[PDB]
Amino acid sequence: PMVTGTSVLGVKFEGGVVIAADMLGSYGSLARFRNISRIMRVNNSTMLGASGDYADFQYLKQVLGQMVIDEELLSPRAIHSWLTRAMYSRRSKMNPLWNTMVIGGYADGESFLGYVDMLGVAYEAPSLATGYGAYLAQPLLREVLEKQPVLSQTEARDLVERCMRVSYNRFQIATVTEKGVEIE
Amino acid sequence: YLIGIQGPDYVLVASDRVAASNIVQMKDDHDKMFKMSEKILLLCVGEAGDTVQFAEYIQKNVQLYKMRNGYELSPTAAANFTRRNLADCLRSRTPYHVNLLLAGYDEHEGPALYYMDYLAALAKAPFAAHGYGAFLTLSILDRYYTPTISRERAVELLRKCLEELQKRFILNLPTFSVRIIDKNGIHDL
Amino acid sequence: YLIGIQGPDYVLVASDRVAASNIVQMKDDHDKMFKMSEKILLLCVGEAGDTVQFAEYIQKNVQLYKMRNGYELSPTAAANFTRRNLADCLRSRTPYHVNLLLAGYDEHEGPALYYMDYLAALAKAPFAAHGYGAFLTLSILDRYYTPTISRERAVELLRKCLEELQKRFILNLPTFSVRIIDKNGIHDL
Amino acid sequence: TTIAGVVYKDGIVLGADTRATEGMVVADKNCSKIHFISPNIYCCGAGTAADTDMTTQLISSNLELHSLSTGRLPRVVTANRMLKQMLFRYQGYIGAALVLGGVDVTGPHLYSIYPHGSTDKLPYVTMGSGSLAAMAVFEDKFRPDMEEEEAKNLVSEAIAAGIFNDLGSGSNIDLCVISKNKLDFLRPYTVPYRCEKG
Amino acid sequence: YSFSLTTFSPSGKLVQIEYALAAVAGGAPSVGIKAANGVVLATEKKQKSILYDERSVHKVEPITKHIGLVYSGMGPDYRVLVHRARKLAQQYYLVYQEPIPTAQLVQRVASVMQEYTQSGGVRPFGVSLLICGWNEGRPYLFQSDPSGAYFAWKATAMGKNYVNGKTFLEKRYNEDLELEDAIHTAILTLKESNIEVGICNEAGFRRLTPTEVK
Amino acid sequence: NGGAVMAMKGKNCVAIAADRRFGIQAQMVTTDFQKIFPLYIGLAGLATDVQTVAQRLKFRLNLYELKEGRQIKPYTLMSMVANLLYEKRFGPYYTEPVIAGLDPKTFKPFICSLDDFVVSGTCQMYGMCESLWEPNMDPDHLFETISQAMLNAVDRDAVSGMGVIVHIIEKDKITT
Amino acid sequence: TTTLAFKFRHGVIVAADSRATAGAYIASQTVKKVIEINPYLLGTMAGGAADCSFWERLLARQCRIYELRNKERISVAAASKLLANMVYQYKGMGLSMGTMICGWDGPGLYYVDSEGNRISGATFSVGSGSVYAYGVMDRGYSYDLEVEQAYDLARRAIYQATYRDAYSGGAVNLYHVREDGWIRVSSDNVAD
Amino acid sequence: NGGTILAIAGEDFAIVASDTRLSEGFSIHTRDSPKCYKLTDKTVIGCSGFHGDCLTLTKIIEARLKMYKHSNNKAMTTGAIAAMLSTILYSRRFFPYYVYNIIGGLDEEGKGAVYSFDPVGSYQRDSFKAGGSASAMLQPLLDNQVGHVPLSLDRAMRLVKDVFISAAERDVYTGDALRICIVTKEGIRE
Amino acid sequence: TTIMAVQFDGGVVLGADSRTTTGSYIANRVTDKLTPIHDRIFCCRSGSAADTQAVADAVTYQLGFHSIELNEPPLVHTAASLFKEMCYRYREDLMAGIIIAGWGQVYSVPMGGMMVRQSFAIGGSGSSYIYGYVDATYREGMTKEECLQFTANALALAMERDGSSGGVIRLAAIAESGVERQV
Amino acid sequence: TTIMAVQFDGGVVLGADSRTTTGSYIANRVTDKLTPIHDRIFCCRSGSAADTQAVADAVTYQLGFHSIELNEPPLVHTAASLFKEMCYRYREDLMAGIIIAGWGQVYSVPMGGMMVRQSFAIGGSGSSYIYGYVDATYREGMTKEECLQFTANALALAMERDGSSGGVIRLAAIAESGVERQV
């Protein structure tokens, strides 16, 4: 794997899904691309962020856009489902993708937040944080969940706004909203 | 272990009757005889199926020829045929590890036996041996053997070689499937 | 290969007379007997000098004791002594690879033989064997052997085990140096 | 294997979890880790429990000999300096790491000490398998000016963050206060068919 | 050197050790009593010039959690002997993990003092010292001396005029006596022959607290 | 190689048990191989280390037991083997000692292992015994739970079994 | 994973221990190694567990396609031969087994190793414990053997194998292929 | 990665219970996952080993059983799965599916079914099996109190339940919430 | 190596050095690394020269075959997308650090192969030394003249430390109605 | 890492960052790497913290034991020579990139261990990014004030790119009659 960004977060707000991610695409200790926007906006609402080798993000950004663009002229669950097929198929030849992506999409009153591991492991989870927050951000997400079992518009919002301060502070705060597809 | 002797009006070949994976032999009846014609006789030491997966693959061709042409191949002809196969397999995915003696008796070209390396290095052999007991035995046969001999004497010359495989060698190879090839064709001994 | 049997008023031990580097045995008189006292008898299978560079190193101590104390050690006592040495060598620069049976006959504690692993894992053995022919033989002796037996019967029980090393095993170990230890002390058979 | 410490106003709340695992099996669900180096100073251990226990026993006998000799209860920095050296000399053969906390008239000090021998005092430190998860909570929540009793509400949750989120670390929190005011050991502290005879 | 300075007299007496016993005869008096609450050890020390200090070098130095020493003899020798006694105690704690039995520390330290009555180039230790300890159900009161011979005692005395001090200890006291009451015989046997004192009980080894010594 | 080391503490009676076998590779050597050496100890792991630690420990222990006729405390014995094995942290002997037996004269059990019940060995045991353990058993019961745990964990296990020995330490009796 | 077989004048007996293992954990002790292909000839399983099932499923399939098409029985010689050919192709792939073809033909016992070692003896034991099983086997074996004496011999030889082999435990499972064909002669226990 | 599965069927119940959690290394990622996906009113399949494979495998199983359900228009037998799934594991064996799957379909005879698997295919009808990480912990104990019972269901539920309490506090890869899927004649009973 | 691309005004101003060393031994000091792949779009390269000869030219083939049909100068990101494709499909049989410009639109391609539009970039193993000089100079409000002195002075500082770069500093100026390549 | 040493006037002005990461996970942001080894001579470090704890302190031991006997502040190059010795004798069991200063005399020690007097230096794996900013600023005729802004601004640019350095920028000022350590 070549140049790699990390630090992608996701978590739902009732009628929305905040997904923030910093914009570094470091290669080695050097932070070669302190400009990469890793939060693709898939559909009028749903979206993927990616934390892993960025070449793989480019491949799957253009390919996931192929599947959506095709189908449009012919749901987050479906995109994650296929995404697991893509990550898996590349693992089968032992030519994986190094990408690990969260897919947050508000579908019919439900905030699906899939997580697709590079080696094809897959699940939905309400408060997902990919690498470097998959040991650090994750308790900060849970500690709110240990106390209150759901998160409101404002709760998950502030949670991520602080948790990202807990890379560099240049992160874009994408926010699915009942409508869908925001970015700050 | 395999042994071969070229005589005035015969070819003499003989084989240990054994195979072993593990610490034990699992048979002592194992035929390293691979007779293929009236007077064309492979003897194949080598590990596993490759010795017989090859031997039969040659046999069915050597036989296929006889039906298709109405006559039997020369010991040389069969020899160069098997030689060709082994050279092809060396460069292949499957290089067979078969060290074999193609005994045979042409009538008008006379008795001939051929040593054949697993790599595929055919050579006519006045006398030859194969296996790992070959390092021991070939000296006895090289000292003792002369141009003349007789089939009656061939038995003694061969019986003396049998002593090396028990008396000085570590492995017990206890019965020897002696056989001859003579104008008459093959006989067991 | 080594074999040991514990009997009512004896200890029976026996050894193949062989060693081989290379494809050949270089002797068939090789004594895997390492008798060290009137009734303390090591038998050491193992490669190279280590079997005898160890055996004698024990022997001279076991003997040094007898002059220095005026009496002979117990089979157990000698056993725990050699056990100690092998444990020390395991952690050492030189870990010996000797698999040995310390036969012996105490008078008031009675006949005893001990299996000893090269690592050093002493254990009293009702019957035992060593070598690689041990995988074959131990089943025969485990089936056949009972609590009673007799020295007369011990010979048959041992003669039956000899068959395994020729008839099913690959290596030829042809003569067996049978010996006994009985209140009388050691005898060759 | 989540051990932690925090330097609060009057001293150091050390905190620990009662688990030790031999790989994937819990061999001890009540493991003591907040080893008493001295009545004044205590040291949590992490990494290999064997190295941590034994090295702590060595420094214990050492510290208790020096204080036994001067008759003056030893300083924290002393404990740290011999720990710095002790964990350096082996060069990674002592692969178990230590969180030492103590108070001397000079006041509180709490050094995390990595097994290659780096000693770094800081207001919050964590170590063990759970340390990443624990330190994010200590970062987010620790505040300077924290009081004495709120630290109990700051290490029990932080260690709890390592109990749930991690799989090497679990079981009852231990929490051991260090202050010249009082010392506290709370050994099991925070809790978050019959084979018929004859 | 490599050659011991201890050699027998014509009838078999260790002359240098006997002279070491003469060095024990010097030094300020010591006293120690096993009472039944806990042992007490006490010793004369003096202002001497009136410019001294009294908390600088106590003859009463704790060795282990509940053992202590009091010496008579040369003071310089005590400072190092104590060091090895503490060495044996801490070494014992890391190996055995219990504070070492009183009888054992006395034995091991006795062996240290025996080594120089056989060891080259060294004189025997002048210091003789009470070693008072309490484990389990028993207060222990020991006397190690220059040859490395040691004895447990019920009451004993050392230094100047031990000869009369022991006499008082067998008639003015016997059996048992509550710890300050068996300190009564200490303060009044010591009187026969400034002062430091230290007691044992079961309260962690202890120096009798200065306001209460008074 | 190895071998299993059951150990269990219910009421003053202190159970401990072990398989009596060891293997040269996957072939059984002996159906009788002592692992529980008499306050008892049961070592398992390598046979070389089983025997080495048993010898070295009895030596160090006897020097103490002659030096004081005072019987050893279980905790001090635990320290004795703890220090004895940690001396090789560069060349560590592979054996897992699990002492079991009474604290002297107070009839108080102390079981422990060294790198309720402590199981160790090649094994099957830690998951088997844990919810079966009753905090109170008469020896009559104690034998039964430990014998079940022993037989069930070890019959399943490949490299252990073929003989069981059970000491249920008590001042009154020590059953086997 | 022991599977002895031997033939004598009143049958071919094939005994097998039932233990199967992964690591030093024993997943089960219930497997019957002598995977069926034919009422009157039968397989074996030694080496990896899955291999033998799969290969002998292919074998059973091919023997069935043959018996339908050729309209005759497949022989022990032919059965072992098709088997030997089929396992050869996967030589170097680690598909290791020690299947044996047994069955009355006279009786036919052919040991068939995974590297293609289709050898015809009369007396075999295959697997880990085979070296134990062999030594007992030769000592009672004679061609002059009663169906009962042979039952005892198969049971003793399996019993002495399982006794030492750590990875072989479970009950003896005789099948006797007499003239007519096989029957589950004994499934009896070892823990007797 | 891994985690524990367990299944017992005597009488009609095929109790397939399993822990929810998946751990990528140690980083427990969701605590809400089931291992025991339902496939049919009768079919329930635990799958432990590797989640990424477990997903792919179960989708392949579901697709194949639907293909059968079209091809024969007859419900997929539990015994058909025992013989079918082993071939599916063999199909990708030289690169293998690191998956241990326990099958629980309700028989035609109204009885329980359990079929142990390994990564290359060893289907086993048995009275019980636990697979996964804690399987070594659970098999001797669970075997002892289950293996003259009429498969008592209430005591059996407690017996399934308690062993996962014991495994969860002992093995660090079994835990959180326990999901049970009994399979009775009334249907799957989650 | 040093590839130093800067954007602006009529079009990019960008530069590269002159050496194409194999190991420590220089082979050439005259190499033009800024070489054309279209009239507008001129490639710059790092990774190896050998993999970049195979690439770039093949992109010229496709790109000039892009231009004839569409009868428009090919889009810079189109060319850059061809570099993403060529590099993406073999990232393992390839090494390439391109910096594609065109007319100005500075585009880049990490060897792994992701086309990521930079606004200024540097490539090579000599590039890194530049960072403290570029970041502290690039400024909005700088006229076209500035970038010439900026890139030309940047590279030289890079070269002083780098023992892979030296040679003559060669600059492209690619812009509407001209390519002013100084050296 | 970033060690950024500059010299001039009364004495050195030099600085270092605050992080002592182990891998990608930061352990601490408050670490003082500029730490004293004498009143005059204060060490700076790169390589590992762990090898440098063993070193430096041992140089303080020797150096402060240097000072008592000679009753003069120890020569900076003497201390630096002790670092050459300690590093030279174990270069293989060690990693250390020191930058020793004293009073100002900026001295350095490559891990291999050669003490080579720099006049300004940078150390670490974050250092390299600085080169284009230092070389193009260091100038004879700059007053004492300049070096403060220079080092403090240099490091920050270094840190932007380096994902090993961040934290608070800490500066020593070591001189005659004072050590003004800002942060």
**Chains in contact with chain G (at least 3 beta-carbon pairs closer than 8 A):** B, C, F, H
Is chain I touching chain D, with at least 3 CB–CB pairs below 8 Å? no
Q: How many CB atoms sit inside 10 A of residue A142's CB?
A: 18
Q: Quote the CA–CA distance of D4 and D160 in Å, as a whole number.
A: 11
β-bridge partners, G175: G14
- As for how many domains chain G has, the answer is 1
The answer to whether the beta carbons of residues J76 and J41 sit under 8 Å apart is yes
Q: Quote the CA–CA distance of I86 and G9 in Å, as a whole number.
A: 74
Q: Quote the CA–CA distance of G151 and G175 in Å, as a whole number.
A: 9
Q: How many CB atoms sit inside 10 A of residue E140's CB?
A: 22
**Residue G167, amino acid:** Y
Number of alpha carbons in the 13 Å side-chain half-sphere of residue I33: 35
Q: Which residues 54-83 of chain D have a CB within 8 Å of chain E?
A: 57-58, 60-61, 64-65, 68-69
Residue closest to F36 by CA, chosen among F63, F78, F76, F6: F6
Q: Quote the CA–CA distance of J30 and J168 in Å, as a whole number.
A: 7
- As for how many domains chain H has, the answer is 1
Domain interval for residue H144? 1-190
β-bridge partners, A182: A175
Q: Where would I find the H helices in H29-77?
A: 51-71
Q: Quote the CA–CA distance of C79 and C96 in Å, as a whole number.
A: 16
Domain interval for residue E202? 1-214
Where do we find the tokens 């659970």? H138
Strand J3-6 and strand J13-16: pairing?
antiparallel
Is chain J touching chain C, with at least 3 CB–CB pairs below 8 Å? no
Domain interval for residue G163? 1-192
The answer to whether the beta carbons of residues C144 and C157 sit under 8 Å apart is yes
Q: Quote the CA–CA distance of C54 and C65 in Å, as a whole number.
A: 17
In this structure, what DSSP letter does residue G5 have?
E
Where do we find the tokens 């003569």? C175
Is chain H touching chain E, with at least 3 CB–CB pairs below 8 Å? no
**Chains in contact with chain I (at least 3 beta-carbon pairs closer than 8 A):** A, J
User: Measured between CB atoms, does G119 come within 8 Å of chain F?
Assistant: no
Residue closest to J16 by CA, chosen among J172, J174, J173: J172
Taking an 8 Å cut-off on Cβ atoms, the answer to whether C143 and G133 are in contact is no
How close I33 comes to chain A (CA, Å)?
22
**Residue H110, amino acid:** G
Residue closest to J179 by CA, chosen among J39, J55, J44: J39
- As for how many domains chain E has, the answer is 1
Taking an 8 Å cut-off on Cβ atoms, the answer to whether J160 and I130 are in contact is no
Integer distance in angstroms from the first to the last C-alpha of chain G? 20
Residue closest to C139 by CA, chosen among F20, F156, G125: G125
Q: Quote the CA–CA distance of H149 and B120 in Å, as a whole number.
A: 69
Q: Quote the CA–CA distance of B21 and G110 in Å, as a whole number.
A: 16
**Residue F52, amino acid:** T
Q: What residues of F are in contact with residue D194 (Cβ under 8 Å)?
A: 132, 134, 145
Backbone angles phi, psi at I68, to 5 degrees: -70, -40
**Residue A100, amino acid:** T
How close J161 comes to chain A (CA, Å)?
5
**Which tokens go with A134?**
């998959």
Method by which the model was determined: cryo-EM
How close B34 comes to chain C (CA, Å)?
23
Which chain G residue lies closest to F25 (C-alpha atoms)? Answer: G166
User: Best interface-test mutation with A: which of I114, I131, I135 has the largest number of A CBs within 10 A?
Assistant: I114
Q: Quote the CA–CA distance of J79 and J174 in Å, as a whole number.
A: 15
Residue E206, SS3 per DSSP: strand
> Helix axis angle, J76-89 relative to J57-70, nearest 10°?
140
Q: How far is CA B50 from the centre of its chain?
A: 16
Q: What residues of B are in contact with residue G117 (Cβ under 8 Å)?
A: 19, 21, 26, 48-49
User: Measured between CB atoms, does C135 come within 8 Å of chain B?
Assistant: yes
Q: Which residues 25-64 of chain A have a CB within 8 Å of chain H?
A: none
Q: What residues of C are in contact with residue F46 (Cβ under 8 Å)?
A: 119, 121
Phi-psi region of G121 (alpha: psi -120 to 50; beta: other; left: phi over 0): beta
- As for how many domains chain D has, the answer is 1
Q: Quote the CA–CA distance of G100 and G83 in Å, as a whole number.
A: 10
Architecture of domain F1-176: 4-Layer Sandwich (3.60)
The answer to whether the beta carbons of residues B136 and C142 sit under 8 Å apart is no
Q: How many CB atoms sit inside 10 A of residue J52's CB?
A: 22
Q: Quote the CA–CA distance of I17 and I22 in Å, as a whole number.
A: 15
β-bridge partners, D103: D108
Which chain G residue lies closest to B20 (C-alpha atoms)? Answer: G117
D186 Cβ neighbours under 8 A, 6+ residues apart: D174, D175, D176
- As for how many domains chain J has, the answer is 1
User: Measured between CB atoms, does G51 come within 8 Å of chain B?
Assistant: no
Q: How many CB atoms sit inside 10 A of residue D194's CB?
A: 12
Q: Among partner residues A120, A124, A134, which is closest to H27 by beta-carbon distance?
A: A134
Long-range contacts of the stretch F33-37 (C-beta < 8 A, 24+): F33/C123, F33/F3, F35/F3, F35/F5, F35/F165, F36/F165, F36/F167
Q: Quote the CA–CA distance of G128 and B93 in Å, as a whole number.
A: 31
Q: What is the CATH number of the domain that holds I140?
A: 3.60.20.10
H39 Cβ neighbours under 8 A, 6+ residues apart: H45, H58, H61, H62, H65, H105
**Which tokens go with I138?**
């690039």
Strand H14-19 and strand H178-184: pairing?
antiparallel
Residue I124, SS3 per DSSP: coil
Q: Quote the CA–CA distance of G49 and G52 in Å, as a whole number.
A: 6
Which chain E residue lies closest to F70 (C-alpha atoms)? Answer: E101
How close H23 comes to chain D (CA, Å)?
8
Beta-strand runs (E) in chain E: 30-33, 40-43, 61-64, 67-72, 128-135, 138-144, 150-152, 155-158, 196-199
CA dihedral D165, D167, D171, D176 (to 10 degrees): -70
Backbone angles phi, psi at D165, to 5 degrees: -70, -25
Taking an 8 Å cut-off on Cβ atoms, the answer to whether C120 and F51 are in contact is yes
* The listed CATH number (3.60.20.10, 3.40.225.10, 3.50.50.60, 3.40.50.1000) that belongs to domain B1-189: 3.60.20.10
**Which tokens go with A103?**
């897919």
The answer to whether the beta carbons of residues A149 and A157 sit under 8 Å apart is no
Taking an 8 Å cut-off on Cβ atoms, the answer to whether F86 and D54 are in contact is yes
CA dihedral H134, H140, H144, H146 (to 10 degrees): 50
User: Best interface-test mutation with H: which of A85, A92, A115, A123 has the largest number of H CBs within 10 A?
Assistant: A123
> What is the largest distance, in Å, between two alpha-carbon atoms of chain D?
66
**Which tokens go with I79?**
């060319």
- C-alpha triplet F85, F91, F92: angle, nearest 5°: 35
Q: Quote the CA–CA distance of B62 and B78 in Å, as a whole number.
A: 7
Which chain C residue lies closest to B19 (C-alpha atoms)? Answer: C170
Taking an 8 Å cut-off on Cβ atoms, the answer to whether A139 and D157 are in contact is no
Q: Quote the CA–CA distance of F104 and J52 in Å, as a whole number.
A: 52
Taking an 8 Å cut-off on Cβ atoms, the answer to whether C23 and B170 are in contact is yes
Q: What residues of E are in contact with residue F68 (Cβ under 8 Å)?
A: 101, 103-104
Q: Where are the domains of chain F?
A: 1-176
Q: Quote the CA–CA distance of I4 and I158 in Å, as a whole number.
A: 10
How close J97 comes to chain I (CA, Å)?
19
Q: Quote the CA–CA distance of A15 and E39 in Å, as a whole number.
A: 79
Q: Which residues of D are catalytic?
A: 1
**Which tokens go with D66?**
């020096």
Q: What residues of J are in contact with residue D117 (Cβ under 8 Å)?
A: 50, 53-54
Q: Quote the CA–CA distance of H128 and A52 in Å, as a whole number.
A: 42
- Indicate the length of chain B as a whole number: 189
Strand-by-strand arrangement of the D11-17 sheet? D124-127, D3-8, D11-17, D173-178, D186-190
Where do we find the tokens 């590992």? J48
Q: Quote the CA–CA distance of H125 and H116 in Å, as a whole number.
A: 7
Phi-psi region of G119 (alpha: psi -120 to 50; beta: other; left: phi over 0): beta
Q: What is the 3-class SS of chain F, one letter each residue?
A: CCCEEEEEECCCCEEEEEECCEEECCEEEECCCCCEECCEEEEEECHHHHHHHHHHHHHHHHHHHHHCCCCCCHHHHHHHHHHHHHCCCCCCCCEEEEEECEECCCCEECCEECCCECCEECCCCHHHHCCCCCCCCCHHHHHHHHHHHHHHHHHHCCCCCCCEEEEEECCCCCEC
Active-site hit among G1, G2, G3, G44: G1
Q: What residues of A are in contact with residue D136 (Cβ under 8 Å)?
A: 135-140, 166
The answer to whether G22 is a known ligand-binding residue is: no
Residue H112, SS3 per DSSP: coil
E134 Cβ neighbours under 8 A, 6+ residues apart: E38, E39, E66, E102, E140, E200, E201, E202
The CA distances from residue A107 to A15, A63, A78, A177, I165, in Å, are 9, 22, 11, 11, 55
Q: How many CB atoms sit inside 10 A of residue G183's CB?
A: 12
Domain interval for residue I49? 1-183
CA dihedral E191, E196, E202, E203 (to 10 degrees): 140
CA dihedral D175, D176, D179, D181 (to 10 degrees): 90
Q: Quote the CA–CA distance of I9 and I146 in Å, as a whole number.
A: 11
**Which tokens go with I97?**
């650090």
In this structure, what DSSP letter does residue I129 have?
G
Beta-strand runs (E) in I22-177: 45-47, 96-98, 120-123, 170-175
